[PDB]
Amino acid sequence: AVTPSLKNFLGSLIAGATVLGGIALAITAVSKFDK
Amino acid sequence: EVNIYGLTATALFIIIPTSFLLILYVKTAST
Amino acid sequence: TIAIGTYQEKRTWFDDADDWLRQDRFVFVGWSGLLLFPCAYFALGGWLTGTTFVTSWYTHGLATSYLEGCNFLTAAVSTPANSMAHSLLFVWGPEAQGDFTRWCQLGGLWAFVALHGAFGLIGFMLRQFEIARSVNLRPYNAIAFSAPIAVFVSVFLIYPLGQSGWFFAPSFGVAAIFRFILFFQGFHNWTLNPFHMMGVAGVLGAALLCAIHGATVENTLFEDGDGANTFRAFNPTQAEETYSMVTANRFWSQIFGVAFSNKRWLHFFMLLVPVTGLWMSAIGVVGLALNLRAYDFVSQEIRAAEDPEFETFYTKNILLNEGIRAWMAAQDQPHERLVFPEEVLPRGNAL
Amino acid sequence: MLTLKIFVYTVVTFFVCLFIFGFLSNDPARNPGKN
Amino acid sequence: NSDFQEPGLVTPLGTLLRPLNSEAGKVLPGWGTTVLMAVFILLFAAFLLIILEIYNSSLILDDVSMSWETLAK
Amino acid sequence: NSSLWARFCEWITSTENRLYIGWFGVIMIPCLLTATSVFIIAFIAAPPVDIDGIREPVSGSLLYGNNIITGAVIPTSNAIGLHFYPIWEAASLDEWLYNGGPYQLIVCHFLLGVYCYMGREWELSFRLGMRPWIAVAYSAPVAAASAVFLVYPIGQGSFSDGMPLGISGTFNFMIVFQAEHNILMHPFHMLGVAGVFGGSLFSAMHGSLVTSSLIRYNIVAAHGYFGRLIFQYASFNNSRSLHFFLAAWPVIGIWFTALGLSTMAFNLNGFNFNQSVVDSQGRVLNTWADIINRANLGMEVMHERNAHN
Amino acid sequence: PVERPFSDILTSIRYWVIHSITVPALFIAGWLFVSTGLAYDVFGTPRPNEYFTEDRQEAPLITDRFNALEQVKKLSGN
Amino acid sequence: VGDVNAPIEYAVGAAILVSLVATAIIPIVLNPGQQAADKIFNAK
Amino acid sequence: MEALVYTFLLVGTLGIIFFSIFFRDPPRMIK
Amino acid sequence: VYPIFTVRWLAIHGIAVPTIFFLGAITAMQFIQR
Amino acid sequence: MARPNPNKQVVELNRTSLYWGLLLIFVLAVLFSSYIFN
Ligand code: CLA
Ligand code: CLA
Ligand code: CLA
Ligand SMILES: C=Cc1c(C)c2cc3nc(c4c5[nH]c(cc6nc(cc1[nH]2)C(C)=C6CC)c(C)c5C(=O)[C@@H]4C(=O)OC)[C@@H](CCC(=O)OC/C=C(\C)CCC[C@H](C)CCC[C@H](C)CCCC(C)C)[C@@H]3C
Ligand SMILES: CC(C)=CCC/C(C)=C/CC/C(C)=C/CC/C(C)=C/CC/C(C)=C/CC/C(C)=C/CC/C(C)=C/CC/C(C)=C/CC/C(C)=C/CC1=CC(=O)C(C)=C(C)C1=O
Ligand SMILES: CCCCCCCCCCCCCCCC(=O)OC[C@H](COP(=O)(O)OC[C@@H](O)CO)OC(=O)CCCCCCCCCCCCCCC
Ligand SMILES: CCCCCCCCCCCCCCCC(=O)OC[C@H](COP(=O)(O)OC[C@@H](O)CO)OC(=O)CCCCCCCCCCCCCCC
Ligand SMILES: CCCCCCCCCCCCCCCC(=O)OC[C@H](COP(=O)(O)OC[C@@H](O)CO)OC(=O)CCCCCCCCCCCCCCC
Ligand SMILES: CC1=C(/C=C/C(C)=C/C=C/C(C)=C/C=C/C=C(C)/C=C/C=C(C)/C=C/C2=C(C)CCCC2(C)C)C(C)(C)CCC1
Ligand SMILES: CC1=C(C)C(=O)C(CC[C@](C)(O)CCC[C@H](C)CCC[C@H](C)CCCC(C)C)=C(C)C1=O
Ligand SMILES: [Fe+2]
């Protein structure tokens, strides 16, 4: 069964993926604007 | 003769590096 | 055959990202910046927030915050309680369950700061490597920093990992660090361990070298300026050195007995001393983490126990350690629920 | 031990007199500079 | 030097194993297959995190008991 | 020029000797030689000494069951207090040993030797054309040693409070301060710790940059690295100011810590934050200072004998 | 594209117009944050009169890992 | 209990004094650094 | 036995110090 | 010279805003009767 | 027994290095002998 701790862990995985994607998008957009 | 192993350890640690360094110095000084 | 050189292909997103990151601005971001800046920023922010608002009432039974009326020397970010043995104390973890107030109360802020700070140190080392590669210099600053990172890793992660839990790691503060130092002096006899002796020698020798080199260089300058002050008689584009090596060499060969005759060797010795000292100290604390302490000198203990009329400073140090332990464990370790009656507390009156 | 006292006093006086008569024998003018 | 100072010794095993040590320095154009490596690295990191949390009691699973008592299965 | 005095002056003042002597040399040489001779002899084969003056001798010589770490030369007895106790003042050599005269002998001769070494540094610097400001740098360790070995006993009133010449003696010395005066919280000791740590940091980093720059540029190349590493552009762009800063930081730190120890000799104290936080109704909430104070209280209680037979 | 010198902004008018009305807002926000009592609620720091609960007259102790939330809620009296 | 004794009048009075003393000296400390960084940059 | 070992080690250290002071190779590299 | 919202702007503001907030908080804490 | 190896240098150790090594070993022995003997 999906224990609450496992649900929280999957949520943390999603949040980390979101943070990394945000950083990547920021660098990409800024580089494209400047070049 | 107390802690014979300790005495042997001290003697080896004082002799082996000293002999190695002295042999190296004599070998190189010939150049 | 189809040979190839370097960068003879079409440009890619990676090329644009690299070009933007490695620009010339007031702040050098670089690739290591992505890992360094966020982590260090959050570490500093967490420390300040913990020292300003959060308290340690429910972990150590103390009051450590400006909101509670503590000075800059007594405020600190206390470690989590001993019940939380080695949990990483995530906000979403089984302990906090997602409540920020309870997360702060239990003491996960310490783990937050410690982890993000360790990753910040890694990022800083990578930044030094990146700068050195960019400007084409050998990376010796990398090793010079590899020393303190090793010391930090040892003290703040390996020592608690061998003990009961995070409760015994340093708390980020001044009075907390003093408590830590006294705690080792009492329980481990950390002052008698050879590794701390070597570290002390290394640090003191580093200070000595700094002072002596500065004094010698500043007291052997060449006459290349009419003004009374020698600071303005120099520009960064000088060709020759600003001080006479021969005169300093003769002076220190006639005063002390042995003197340097090679700039590279001198500055490399400067680099070498402190790094070795701190590495040896780190190894010593690594050993202590497993309660592998140099405490006994069993022969002296046996001789002292045999007859009371034989006292050396070592026995007095042992007695002082006993006193420290007995009198401080009462409130230093609340989870043990220790209540020593005044009859049993060690005292010099009873020897 | 009076003899030891006498010997120590004599030695100390000799050395101190040597030092004093040393620094008084035109110290400042014996330097590598010329002025 | 000529052919790096004349040819070396020849042995049957050397001749047999020569093919495995011939194409030195060959490379593919572009980035090749770095994206697959990145995906695999991410999956490995996730697996390492999962095991680390399982062994640290930060991720309690129904089946695992996480104690010496599991030896009495 | 050919007078015996002239020949002696030329020999003492000559710079062709392997080790320069000078007049400060003629003073310091016998002092330091006597100090080291007596120190070695007492460290090897000295008998017990009653430091506390309660007929409880403390053994510190190697022959009496001791190592390098646990050996030392015990300071003089508490009965002598601050009196002057030369060898010819004691009734007999055995009593002189029992009371602890060689500590006084060593400390006096060594202090004179270090002061004359300070003087000889300037003397040789002047004989060569160098500038005379190395003695100022050397004053820091000399000041600290003079404080610890002479000023603290004067303030406390006895030489038994001096630092025993050993390792475990030094550790006991430090522990007794932390018990009595709370040195750790004194601002001057904080400045001393900062000076030592900053000196180590600057030595390591200066060595690293200089070694990296030196290629088969010394300051104009590494400055580009430093300005962008931790920001802080155009801070130490002059090669002379940098070395002056190096020479200045640790010396000032050690001066401040020595002055702090001297002030503690007259017993003001370190800081004291005991019971500085109280809630309503008057109850007391513990802070880290209270734990430090508990450790200090246990230390002090252990040290004092009180009941001495 | 040259990272205008700080001197240029120092003499600007819009810079001062913005900052002289913005910074005081932050300062007053902090003052009201720690004055209204929001800090105690947000960060869980007990008030001076909440240290010792009616039924408890000593420092608290968690002595529990997987039920630390309920333990802390009970000890704090909330 | 744990309320602030002082009123908001002093809050604003001190805000004015500690807000216009920090927004005008943060660019004066960095000016040397920004002036020297450009000299270091675009050179090597 | 321990005392003799300690004395020998200290004497050896002092002897190496003296030899370094008095029998060093001349520093002709830069002088 | 013209564009704003650069790296320097973000870097300075990030450490500037919380500093002012915390200074206000501490100044307010000063005037508590305990 | 096949061909002399071109990569063959010889180690060199000046006197200062020898003094440093002797000092290091003797100092370490001084520091550690008491602990070894207990
Ligand atoms: C580069 C910057 C950086 C770095 C290195 C870290 C690192 C860390 N943070 Mg910090 N953090 C950051 C930025 C950063 N953070 C930012 C920007 C914020 C604000 C949003 C935070 C807010 C924050 C909080 C509030 C907390 C942390 C915590 C942590 C620690 C736990 C890491 C973890 O499990 O997270 C998750 C990490 C990952 C998910 C790794 C990435 C792996 C990806 C997702 C793989 C995906 C592949 C695939 C889809 C997965 C398949 C499996 C499944 C889905 C089927 C760690 C030391 C926690 C901690 O330890 O505090 C005590 C904590 O409580 N951080
Ligand atoms: C003469 C007295 C003396 C001296 C010189 C030393 C010397 C030393 N001791 Mg000490 N010690 C002594 C007596 C002494 N000891 C006594 C009598 C005791 C009682 C037992 C102790 C107890 C003791 C303990 C318990 C410990 C030491 C440690 C050390 C070492 C410190 C290494 C270091 O700098 O780490 C400090 C540096 C770091 C941790 C690096 C962190 C740097 C980060 C990355 C910077 C962060 C950025 C920051 C926010 C920027 C702000 C800058 C701002 C401050 C300006 C060093 C060899 C420590 C050690 O090295 O053990 C391994 C240690 O744990 N000693
Ligand atoms: C991180 C931990 C730490 C650190 C880094 C320090 C650092 C320091 N402490 Mg503190 N201390 C600590 C923890 C710490 N302490 C704790 C926990 C305690 C309580 C247990 C103390 C208690 C304490 C006391 C009580 C004292 C210190 C002192 C000092 C200083 C010692 C170095 C000095 O000034 O000597 C300077 C150099 C000398 C004293 C040596 C002089 C050398 C002479 C002049 C020449 C000798 C010639 C030699 C014999 C011949 C050699 C020739 C050849 C063989 C090489 C330094 C600032 C001392 C201090 O401040 O000094 C005033 C002091 O008195 N500390
Ligand atoms: C008291 C000890 C001590 C401190 C505080 C210190 C501090 C520093 N040294 C640095 C550098 C160095 N240190 C070096 C050698 C040494 N440094 C030493 C000892 C120290 N060095 C010693 C003994 C050596 C000899 C080996 C070198 C060789 C370098 C450098 O190259 C570098 C430099 O250029 O400096 C000029 C800087 C690294 C910046 C940084 O953190 O990156 C950013 C990373 C951050 C901010 C993450 C850290 C987060 C920390 C771990 C969390 C806790 C933060 C709280 C504020 C803790 C407060 C604790 C309370 C008790 C106050 C920083 C100014
Ligand atoms: C009976 C008796 C004898 C009693 C003795 C009892 C007893 C206690 C014995 C002592 C025991 C003992 C030896 C203890 C110490 C043991 C110990 C802790 C060892 C640590 C060893 C160790 C490996 C530590 C690791 C760190 C380490 C390598 C430290 C090195 C320390 C060190 C040598 C520092 C340098 C010291 C020093 C004085 C340097 C000065 C250099 C110098 C002359 C530069 C001058 C100079 C400046 C210029 O600017 C220029 C230009 C020139 C040209 C120039 O020259
Ligand atoms: C996508 C996230 C966007 C930002 C969110 C706000 C960030 C600021 C958070 C401040 C603290 C407030 C409390 C939040 C905490 C909180 O409220 O969590 C709550 C949330 C859900 O828990 P529940 O409240 O549903 O649980 C209740 C019960 O069911 C528990 O048994 O937990 C998660 O799913 C993970 C959330 C992560 C949020 C942190 C984001 C960062 C993740 C780590 C990133 C690492 C990057 C590594 C790169 C290599
Ligand atoms: C009146 C004053 C009398 C002072 C007497 C004491 C002088 C001490 C002489 C130290 C010699 C150390 C060996 C150097 C061996 C040697 O030949 O070094 C020579 C070396 C200079 O070498 P070069 O610059 O020529 O080398 C260039 C390189 O590229 C290699 O060629 O000197 C130094 O680097 C500084 C040495 C300071 C090191 C100080 C160490 C102090 C240790 C003290 C141990 C005491 C133990 C006590 C036990 C009870
Ligand atoms: C089982 C078989 C046996 C195993 C053991 C074998 C051991 C072999 C020997 C290993 C050690 C060799 C050491 C060589 C020593 C040596 O000759 O070094 C010389 C070397 C510098 O060499 P250079 O770069 O000048 O070389 C230039 C070339 O021309 C060759 O000289 O210094 C170092 O790299 C660090 C040396 C150790 C650190 C020295 C300073 C710090 C320690 C001294 C502390 C004194 C006490 C101070 C506190 C009181
Ligand atoms: C919440 C949190 C977070 C974050 C945080 C942060 C990011 C923070 C920051 C913070 C900060 C960023 C802070 C700052 C602060 C500052 C301060 C607090 C300052 C102070 C200062 C002072 C106190 C000064 C003084 C002085 C001077 C210098 C001038 C005059 C003189 C005197 C000495 C008076 C997160 C979400 C991630 C997670 C969870 C937790
Ligand atoms: C020419 C030009 C320059 C010089 C410039 O700085 C910008 C702003 C980009 C950005 C907002 O800084 C993007 C910052 C986002 C960054 C990628 C996030 C990850 C890295 C760090 C967290 C950034 C903060 C570092 C700072 C604290 C030193 C633009 C748009 C331009 O056109
Ligand atoms: Fe230098």
DSSP A3-34: -HHHHHHHHHHHHHHHHHHHHHHHHHHHHHHH
Please work out whether the CB of residue C66 comes within 6 Å of at least one atom of ligand 7: no
**Distance of alpha carbon C59 from alpha carbon E20, whole angstroms:** 63
B26 contacts chain I (CB < 8 A): no
Is residue E56 within 8 Å of residue C86, measured between CB atoms?
yes
The DSSP code for F66 is -
Provide the 8-state DSSP code for G60. Answer: -
Q: Give yes or no for a contact between F228 and C138, defined as CB atoms under 8 angstroms apart.
A: no
The type of residue at I17 is: I
Are F293 and F232 a contacting pair, CB within 8 Å?
Answer: no
3-class DSSP state of F49: strand
Return the DSSP state at E1.
-
**Which pairs with CB-CB distance under 8 Å and at least 24 residues apart come from C102-105?**
C102/G44, C102/G68, C102/G69, C102/G72, C102/G73, C104/C50, C104/C54, C104/G43, C104/G44, C105/C54, C105/C55, C105/C58, C105/G44, C105/G72, C105/G76
Contacts of F23 (CB under 8 A, 6+ apart): D18, D19, D22, D23, F12, F123
Query: d(Cα F276, Cα C184) in Å, to the nearest integer?
Result: 26
Which tokens in the block code for residue D22?
């040393």
Q: At what angle do helices C194-218 and F187-213 cross, to 10 degrees?
A: 70
Question: Which residues in chain K have Cβ-Cβ distances shorter than 8 Å to I8?
Answer: none
Quote the CA–CA distance of C29 and F228 in Å, as a whole number. Answer: 10
The DSSP annotation for C151-198 comes to HHHIIIIIHHHHSSSGGGSPPEEHHHHHHHHHHHHHHT-GGGSHHHHH
Chain centroid offset of residue F173 CA: 12
User: What gap in Å lies between CA F243 and CA C210, rounded to an integer?
Assistant: 9
The span from the CA of B21 to the CA of J28, in Å, is 69
Residue of H37, F230, F246 lying closest to C145 (CA atoms) = F230
Chain breaks in chain G (C to N over 2.5 A) after: none
Is the CB–ligand 5 distance for residue C208 below 6 Å?
yes
Domains of chain G: 3-78 (1.20.5.860)
Are J25 and G39 in contact by the 8 Å Cβ rule? The answer is yes
Q: I5 C-alpha vs ligand 1 centroid, how far in Å? A: 58
Enumerate the H helices of chain F as residue ranges.
Answer: 4-13, 22-45, 93-99, 101-128, 135-146, 152-156, 168-180, 187-213, 222-229, 239-265, 288-303
| Nearest-5° Cα angle at C65, C60 to C66 | 165
Residue whose pair of structure tokens reads 């005081």 in the numeric block: G24
Q: Which two tokens stand for residue G31?
A: 């003052």
- CA nearest neighbour of F211 among C134, C345, I8, C272: C272
* Breaks in chain F listed by the residue before each, with C–N > 2.5 Å: 216
Helix or strand (DSSP H, E) at C144: helix C141-153
Both structure tokens of C115: 């982890």
3-class SS at F72? strand
Distance CA A15, CA C46 (A): 20
The neighbour count for residue C305, using CB atoms within 10 Å, is 10
CA atoms within 13 A on the CB side of C289: 20
| Torsion over CA: E60, E62, E63, E69 (sign) | positive
DSSP class of residue F152? H
Helices marked H in J1-34 — which ranges?
A: 7-30
The tokens describing F166, both together, are 């050993």
F153-190 CB burial, b ≥16 within 10 A, e <16: beebebbbbbbbbbbbbbbbbebbbbbbbbbbbbebbb
Dihedral pair phi/psi, residue F278, rounded to 5°: -140, 135
Residue whose structure tokens are 């990676």: C14
Tokens of C294: 């140099």
Q: Is F68 close to K37, i.e. CB distance below 8 A?
A: no
3-state secondary structure of C42: helix
- Contact between C210 and F203 under an 8 Å Cβ cutoff? The reply is yes
Check: CB of residue F298 under 8 Å from CB of residue C328: yes
Spatial neighbors of K11 by CB under 8 A, at least 6 apart, are B24, B27, B28
> C262 CB contacts (<8 Å, ≥6 apart)?
I29, I30
The most distant pair of C-alpha atoms in chain G lies apart, rounded to whole Å, by 67
Q: Is C311 helix (H, G, I), strand (E, B) or coil?
A: strand
Query: Are residues F140 and F254 in contact, defined by beta-carbon separation less than 8 angstroms?
Result: yes
Q: How far are the Cα atoms of C178, F144, F189, F247, F262 from residue F192, in angstroms, in the given order?
A: 15, 11, 5, 15, 14
**Which of K37, C292, C113 is closest to F68 using CA atoms?**
K37
Q: Is F165 helix (H, G, I), strand (E, B) or coil?
A: strand
Please give the Cα distance from C303 to C282 (Å, whole number). Answer: 33
Phi, psi dihedral angles at E57 (to 5 degrees): 65, 20
Its sign, for the CA torsion F240, F242, F248, F251, is negative
Residues 1-30 of K with CB under 8 A from E: 2-3, 6
Which residue's structure tokens are 């290349």?
Answer: C224
Degrees (nearest 5) of the Cα angle E1, E4, E6? 90
Residue type present at position C289? A
Give the count of domains, chain C: 1
What are the CA-CA distances from residue F16 to residues C251, C332, F10 (Å)? 12, 64, 11
3-class DSSP assignment, residue F8: helix
Q: How far apart are the first and last CA of chain D?
A: 54
Between the CA of residue K35 and those of C126, F45, F219, I5, I6, what are the distances in Å? 40, 22, 46, 13, 12
Q: Which two tokens stand for residue C339?
A: 């209540």
Q: Where are the domains of chain E?
A: 6-58
Instruction: Find tokens 């601002």 and name the residue.
Output: F187
Q: Which two tokens stand for residue E38?
A: 């990145």
What's the angle, vertex CA C124, arms to CA C122 and CA C128, rounded to 5? 120
Return the closest-CA partner of residue F305 out of C319, C347, C312, C345: C347
Using the 8-state DSSP alphabet, how is residue C7 labeled?
Answer: S
Q: What is the DSSP string of C45-109?
A: HHHHHHHHT---TTTTS---STTTT--TTT-EEPPPPTTS-S----TTSTTTTT-HHHHHHHTHH
Q: By the CB < 8 Å criterion, does F67 face chain K?
A: yes
Pair E54, E64: CB distance under 8 Å: yes
Amino acid at K23: L
K35/C294 touch (CB, cutoff 8 Å), yes or no:
yes
The reply, when asked if residue C172 is annotated as ligand binding, is: no
Q: How far is K37 from chain F (nearest CA, A)?
A: 9
- SS3 letters across C206-273: HHHHHHHHHHHHHCCECCCCCCCCCCCCCCCCCCCCCECHHHHHHHHHHHCCCCCCCHHHHHHHHHHH
Question: CA-CA distance, B6 to F303, in Å (whole number)?
Answer: 35
What HEC string does D1-35 produce?
CHHHHHHHHHHHHHHHHHHHHHHCCCCCCCCCCCC
Contact G15, G23 (CB under 8 A): no
Distance between CA C252 and CA C216 in Å, rounded? Answer: 9
Phi then psi for residue C311, to 5 deg, are -125, 130
Q: Two tokens at E20?
A: 């495995």
User: Distance, in angstroms, between F190 CA and closest chain D CA?
Assistant: 41
Given an 8 Å threshold on Cβ–Cβ distance, is I5 in contact with B1? no
Determine how many CB atoms are found less than 10 A away from the CB of residue F142. 17
Residue F47 burial (C-beta neighbours within 10 Å; 0-12, 13-18, 19+): middle
User: Which amino acid, C273?
Assistant: V
Tell me the two tokens of residue C7: 């960068």
Distance from C-alpha of F199 to C-alpha of F245, rounded to nearest angstrom: 10
The answer to whether residues F271 and F185 touch, using CB atoms and an 8 Å cutoff, is yes
Inter-residue contact K11 to B24 (CB < 8 Å): yes
CA of K17 to the centre of ligand 8 (A): 6
Task: Provide, as residue numbers in chain I, all residues whose Cβ is less than 8 Å from the Cβ of K30.
Answer: 6, 9-10, 13
Calculate how close chain F gets to I16, using CA atoms only, in Å.
17
In whole angstroms, give the CA distance from residue C84 to residue C92: 15
Among all bound ligands, the one having the nearest atom to the CA of C127 is 4
Which among C165, C171, C340 is positioned nearest to F294, based on CA atoms?
C340
Q: Which chains touch B (3 or more CB pairs under 8 A)?
A: I, K
Q: How far apart, in whole angstroms, are the C-alpha atoms of residue F95 and residue F90? A: 7
C-beta neighbour count of F205 within 10 angstroms = 18
**Residue of chain F whose alpha carbon sits nearest to that of D20:** F23
> Cα(C120)–Cα(C113) distance, rounded to whole angstroms?
10
Give the integer Cα–Cα distance in Å for C340 and F178.
24
Domain hosting residue C145, numbered range:
4-351
Comparing CA positions, the residue from G33, E69, C118, C30 lying closest to residue F229 is C30
Residue A17 known to bind ligand: yes
Contacts of F203 (CB under 8 A, 6+ apart): C206, C207, C209, C210, C213, C270, C271, C273, C274, F246
**Which superfamily does CATH assign the domain made up of E6-58 to?**
Photosystem II reaction center protein H (1.20.5.880)
- Tell me the two tokens of residue C55: 């308290």
N residues, chain A: 35
Residues contacting K10, CB < 8 A, separation 6+: B28, B31
Q: At F133, is the secondary structure helix, strand, or coil?
A: coil
Question: Which of G7, G27, G35 is closest, CB to CB, to H4?
Answer: G35
Give, as one character, the DSSP assignment of residue F58. Answer: B
Distance CA F235, CA F202 (A): 14
Q: Which residues of K touch E2 (CB under 8 A)?
A: none
Q: Which ligand is nearest to the CA of C125?
A: 4
**A8-to-C112, E48, E59 alpha-carbon distances in Å:** 17, 17, 9
Residues across chain D? 35
Atom of ligand 6 nearest to the CA of A20: 48
Distance separating alpha carbons of residues G40 and C54, to the nearest angstrom: 9
Distances (CA, A) of B19 to C283, I6, I21: 28, 21, 22
